[PDB]
Design a protein around this ligand. Structure first.
Ligand SMILES: O=C1NC(=O)c2c1c1c3ccccc3n3c1c1c2c2ccccc2n1[C@H]1CC[C@@H]3O1
Lengths: 264, 5
């Protein structure tokens, strides 16, 4: 069937000092896919990791092609946009919705950790939604392998986004990969339930963070969060990564298992 | 703009 490999780029989905993402529509089938265009003027590693991914809560990777200095990455199109835009400033979103999104985020993270991959930059801007509002973890440009041949590799590279980064990244030379992603998921949960980020960064120098360690939950954003989910956040946002709750235990949390959301 | 798969 001629023309089936032709795609028209009809809309800009993203743009930054790195390249852009365009919505591509198949000339014949009208199928919609996202095309990441990067000028190799890093990408190799991102592609390598994307080739390992196959999960309903992770942006699907269809393949790639390069023409000289430009690399084209064909990725799953999530028409619902970024989770970031479903969060109402200073309000958040309905708890049931947040719980559903959190369940899907955990599913995706469990999957990634299961194959030894850590995302390292989990935040609402990198969590996309499909037409049925299903969450998809996106952008593996900062991702890396932390387990290979059943052997764990401690990380040392400082990366991510400050408001979402775990404290050990700023205090220790080396650290385990998994607790760092768990922490970021905790910050995302806080954002979904309060519509605001708790601190600029998890440092003792940051007043907001010191207040949290001092358990002053009568202050924002904590006072806007119900007791059940707040109890979970108390277990996730723990400074010592070794004492921080693991995903298997997050799955056993009272709030995590509370019936709240009706089916579509 | 357009691209080929
Ligand atoms: O749908 C996507 N599949 C995708 O794969 C995808 C997608 C989007 C997207 C959909 C609606 C509004 C903004 C969007 N962005 C992206 C996006 C990607 C993507 C993949 C790799 C690096 C950056 C990426 N971005 C950036 C971030 C937000 C915006 O542009």
């Amino acid at each position: 069937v001629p023309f089936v490999e032709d795609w028209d780029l009809v809309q800009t989905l993203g743009e930054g000092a790195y390249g852009e993402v365009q919505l591509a529509v198949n000339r014949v089938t009208e199928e919609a896919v996202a095309v990441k265009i990067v000028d190799m003027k890093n990408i190799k590693k991102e592609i390598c990791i994307n080739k390992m991914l196959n999960h309903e809560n992770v942006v699907k990777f269809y393949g790639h092609r390069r023409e000289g200095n430009i690399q084209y990455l064909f990725l799953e199109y999530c028409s619902g946009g970024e989770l970031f835009d479903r969060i109402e400033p200073d309000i958040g979103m309905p708890e049931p919705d947040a719980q559903r999104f959190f369940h899907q985020l955990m599913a995706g993270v469990v999957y990634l950790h299961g194959i030894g991959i850590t995302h390292r930059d989990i935040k609402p801007e990198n969590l996309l939604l499909d037409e049925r509002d299903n969450l998809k973890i996106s952008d593996f440009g900062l991702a890396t392998v932390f387990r290979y041949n059943n052997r764990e590799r401690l990380l040392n590279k400082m990366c991510g986004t400050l408001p979402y980064v775990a404290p050990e990244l700023l205090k220790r030379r080396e650290f385990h990969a998994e607790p760092v992603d768990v922490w970021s998921c905790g910050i995302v949960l806080t954002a979904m339930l309060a519509g605001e980020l708790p601190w600029d960064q998890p440092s003792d120098s940051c007043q907001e963070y010191s207040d949290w360690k001092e358990k002053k939950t009568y202050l924002n954003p904590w006072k806007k969060i119900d007791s059940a989910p707040l109890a979970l956040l108390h277990k996730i946002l723990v400074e010592n990564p070794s004492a921080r709750i693991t995903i298997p235990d997050i799955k056993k949390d009272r709030w995590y298992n509370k019936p709240l959301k009706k089916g579509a | 703009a357009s691209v080929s798969a």
